[PDB]
Design a protein around this ligand. Sequence first.
Ligand SMILES: *[C@@H]1O[C@H](CO)[C@@H](O[C@@H]2O[C@H](CO)[C@@H](O[C@@H]3O[C@H](CO)[C@@H](O)[C@H](O)[C@H]3NC(C)=O)[C@H](O)[C@H]2NC(C)=O)[C@H](O)[C@H]1NC(C)=O
Ligand SMILES: *[C@@H]1O[C@H](CO)[C@@H](O)[C@H](O)[C@H]1NC(C)=O
Ligand SMILES: *[C@@H]1O[C@H](CO)[C@@H](O)[C@H](O)[C@H]1NC(C)=O
Lengths: 412, 444
Amino acid sequence: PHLRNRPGKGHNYIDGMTQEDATCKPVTYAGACSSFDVLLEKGKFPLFQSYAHHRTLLEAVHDTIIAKADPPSCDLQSAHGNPCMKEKLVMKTHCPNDYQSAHYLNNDGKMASVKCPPKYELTEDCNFCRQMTGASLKKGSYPLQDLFCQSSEDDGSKLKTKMKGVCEVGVQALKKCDGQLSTAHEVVPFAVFKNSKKVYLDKLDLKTEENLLPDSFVCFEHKGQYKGTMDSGQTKRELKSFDISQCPKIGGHGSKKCTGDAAFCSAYECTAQYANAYCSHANGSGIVQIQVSGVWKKPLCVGYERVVVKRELSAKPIQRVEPCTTCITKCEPHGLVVRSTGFKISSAVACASGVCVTGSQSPSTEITLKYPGISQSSGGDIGVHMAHDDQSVSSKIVAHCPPQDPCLVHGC
Amino acid sequence: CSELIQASSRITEGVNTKCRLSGTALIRAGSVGAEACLMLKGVKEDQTKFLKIKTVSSELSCREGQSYWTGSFSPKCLSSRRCHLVGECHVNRCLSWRDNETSAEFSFVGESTTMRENKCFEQCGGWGCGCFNVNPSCLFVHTYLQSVRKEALRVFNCIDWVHKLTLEITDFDGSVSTIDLGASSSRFTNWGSVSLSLDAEGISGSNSFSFIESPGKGYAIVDEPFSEIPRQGFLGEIRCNSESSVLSAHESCLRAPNLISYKPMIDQLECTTNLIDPFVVFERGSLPQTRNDKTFAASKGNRGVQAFSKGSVQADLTLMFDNFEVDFVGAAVSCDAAFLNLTGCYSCNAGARVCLSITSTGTGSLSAHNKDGSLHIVLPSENGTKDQCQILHFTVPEVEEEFMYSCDGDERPLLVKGTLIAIDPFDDRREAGGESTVVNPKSG
Ligand SMILES: *[C@@H]1O[C@H](CO)[C@@H](O[C@@H]2O[C@H](CO)[C@@H](O[C@@H]3O[C@H](CO)[C@@H](O)[C@H](O)[C@H]3NC(C)=O)[C@H](O)[C@H]2NC(C)=O)[C@H](O)[C@H]1NC(C)=O
Ligand SMILES: *[C@@H]1O[C@H](CO)[C@@H](O)[C@H](O)[C@H]1NC(C)=O
Ligand SMILES: *[C@@H]1O[C@H](CO)[C@@H](O)[C@H](O)[C@H]1NC(C)=O
């Protein structure tokens, strides 16, 4: 249970729901917090479970990393007639039972939550409040989105949503479109930067780089340990969290003797006397950087949603119209010759009342062909199909010819 | 041109008493543009209903075998670099990464039907690379293909070519009937059925090419054999079974191994590939094309491909149970005719074109017959002066004959003049023959 050694204060509680301060004020190996234990269930919240040693939304809020929205959480008991549930109703979520509250990161990059009236619980889609008699509601709030938060100083005031072929994602109106509008629920990764709003992304590529800052170390201490806090006889072997702000930095001063692994000893001053706490290195921590518009940036925090996107499938798939007539067709006693413009003709076929005749030649602006059947003697109309080198030129043309005299053709 | 005396019925003044003529008829099918002729004679100056089966055209259609679809695809990649011992960056996990298996970092993708693969690459391990550990780190890449253009191409092959005859059936009192049928096949038309023998050749070999069909745009030919297994660097490297699968890059589409080129250079990953644009190849070999004297081209109606090869066939279509008669035709009609000209050749497949000026007071037909009965001329007669044409066969350089023409009335003398051109074969042994020639190229 090393994941319960939270970075920073580890305050996994929300304002108003302060009935679980025994175990939700700093989250430790001992208790059980309703607003945190859901994150560690197998198969749920996999993105945070991968980045398990980064702050949650509530933790980031309590460290002043992420601000709190204006109507911080308009209670449905007192504000069910106000335009509150606008960003919530565009998301597709799934809450478990016996939960009276649920918090999410709104569009402006702040934290807002939905609180059902007392003794009511949130339904399976977190959209309605339902009252079940004789039910014990949990004391925490369900994290709606799957996200992990960190502290950043990189500025992102010029960052904006840039998705191709999207007219509207979530509650953001990307542009104005007319015509067909494909509408569906999609999993859209997002990120929030300093002095910015939510920035939905098309591709989620990110990297982490480790460091030796205090948030990268997991200090603990045994319960009942000699010459330590809570130094009394015990009946169970359990750990206890330790604050790294006490162990002295290298070449510095501190209040508690501290020991640890190689990474801790390389940055802090590992003691030579009896140690008070063991400070290892959070094996997954570091600084996570996102790539937006090719350039890497440091987000306040990233996640993903299930919002409704209004795409545009197509304006026009393809247009195939070509009534081209840039050719001259003049029947000649020597042969059927058609003179065309710049586009060259390699092979052609001539059809006149069933019987057809074909010709092949190198690409040229003109081609001569033998007359099909008795069309030379009888004249009439003759259709010609040819293969142009270019495109957008009609391949079916018709030539009108009067009756001809074979004597000139065979004259010798 | 042939009678039906074996099963002739009594086609009461005016009223019709047709007995559903059951006797079949056997007449050799005429050449291309010619017609097949019938004699429903009743009482002189009455009846004489003519059934005409005009030979529209003969084409060497294609019998398609296997087929598949393809389009233009472009890849997109998602990367996630984690240090050693983080997640599943164990050397064994990084090396054994099964493309079919997805990493836990790109779980927002979740379940999807897009064609996709997953790769894992090692990078530097050490404080210079970015990780305190010295064992190599990992870079998980998820790549999925997406379609660029909203179009697809169908690629098929012709296992064999079949002779196919198009006939214009000029039924009794109305010529609205066109039928297309192959060799040794029957078509259940009105008044029974029509069957074609075409005993000469039911096939014209095979080939080793493949044809592209763009829906609503035309056809094309590629100079490669049709391969049922995808191959890198050829057409159909990525192939599907439907246009929807192509336009959505569905995972059911097959593709060759090692199509995506990965450049894991330390700053940014580069996911790219070199793929043959099927649209370029389609535009390159547009249909109107000639290969070793075959000249494949789009069939009339744009529903397939043809094969213009030198040859000819013998066709003997058989009518059966032909019965289409009414009672209003019992009245006689007057008609007049005037000879116009004579053009064409002799002893030739094309024949000699015969045109006649018809001046009639109403609906009717023409039954000009020569003295010996060898040559028959039939032309419909309509109100006012009309100019209709017919096609006959001759074996004389000059034509000078008289025909007993009568449009359901009295026979009057119709005289035809003119000479016929000579089809220089610059190569003759004893004769030419009519047969039924399928279209052929110049290089034959
Ligand atoms: C032998 O006489 C035939 C019968 O007149 C001619 O064959 C065709 O005659 C048609 C009408 O009798 C003509 O149709 C005309 O076509 C022109 C232009 O193509 C248009 O004005 C109309 O479609 C039509 N005009 C009408 C109905 O008044 C054909 O022009 C004609 N075919 C041709 C081109 O020969 C022959 O002309 C004639 N043979 C010889 C050797 O001259
Ligand atoms: C390393 O961290 C991952 C989560 O980031 C954890 O699953 C794994 O157990 C850790 N390795 C250890 C503790 O050896
Ligand atoms: C694909 O992966 C799944 C789970 O990762 C596995 O059950 C299945 O056997 C794999 N199929 C292969 C390797 O062909």
